Ligand binder design. Sequence first.
Ligand SMILES: O=C(O)C[C@@H](Cc1cccc2ccccc12)N1C(=O)c2ccc(C(=O)O)cc2C1=O
Length: 358
Amino acid sequence: APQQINDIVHRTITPLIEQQKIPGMAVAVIYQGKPYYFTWGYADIAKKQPVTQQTLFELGSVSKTFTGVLGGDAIARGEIKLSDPTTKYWPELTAKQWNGITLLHLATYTAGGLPLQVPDEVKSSSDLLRFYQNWQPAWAPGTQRLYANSSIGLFGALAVKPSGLSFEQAMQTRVFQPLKLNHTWINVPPAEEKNYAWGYREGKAVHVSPGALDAEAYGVKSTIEDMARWVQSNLKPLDINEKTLQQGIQLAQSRYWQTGDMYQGLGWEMLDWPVNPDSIINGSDNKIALAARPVKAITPPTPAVRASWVHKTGATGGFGSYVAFIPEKELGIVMLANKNYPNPARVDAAWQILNALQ
Ligand SMILES: O=C(O)C[C@@H](Cc1cccc2ccccc12)N1C(=O)c2ccc(C(=O)O)cc2C1=O
């Protein structure tokens, strides 16, 4: 690889791993459209299995970027509209608080205070109906953003209804397969089990547990190679031959709401480039990122801006991931780790790397 890339990546990542006691890590840098890969440490400590370019990591909430684009693809196919009432796709949802709550609000966490997590107790379809029926908003729709798996999770489930496909089948057929993400999974198959890293939390080996609307909100597993290709695809959607997928990617980076200096897309979050690093670094802290904040409506939404820092953080109990890119600069990064280490450390390292290559 170019020495510049080698040196910035290693000088930033080595101390990060040391400081954060990360068992295993994979990093991709996309530089002028081409990926460069780096790996450290262990996918499985006990069995002495190293992290490779084929190792699967739990993306956690980075999954929301796939959900957003899949929703975008459905919009482009004419199957749904973000302006549609939630009730259009869920006729059993009769409770009056849902009047005025649209697919846009679900997708962008602005329904009025849907909770971060679907309760563990919610198992069945009848349980889920009861949960959403009984949910009482703190705020009018389209006034406050509160990051929520229960929000974008429901969006994901409803966006695929008109197709008649399950969420997983829809994602496989319409996103993963066209983009040749052949080692990206909602459910890891037996054939790939040898490559599936353990997550580590408080020293114990852990994998994500099943939960309602998990696929839609936090359930994707992927390799560093497929994630680099995912970044390439979002960096440069005009290279994508499938027209509805191309438009869907573009819609996911449209700017729907603004809070502080961030803009909410479908899954993706964006800021103008050049960014104030302090703002993205400090803003990634879950203190801020999980806080209820007032939003300004962008009416109508701004199309995907090339001069953006586009990103998403995501975690599970045992994994920590970050993806960021700058379309204008054909520059991007993917950082996958099998420890949930603090968001700001992720973003700081990503900033340092991309800033040096920009
Ligand atoms: O960083 C993210 O991607 C979002 C966070 C949001 C979240 C969900 C549940 C409990 C949490 C506790 C502290 C902080 C965030 C939490 N998140 C999740 O969204 C999430 C889903 C599943 C698991 C699991 O290991 O079963 C863990 C998490 C998880 O930490």
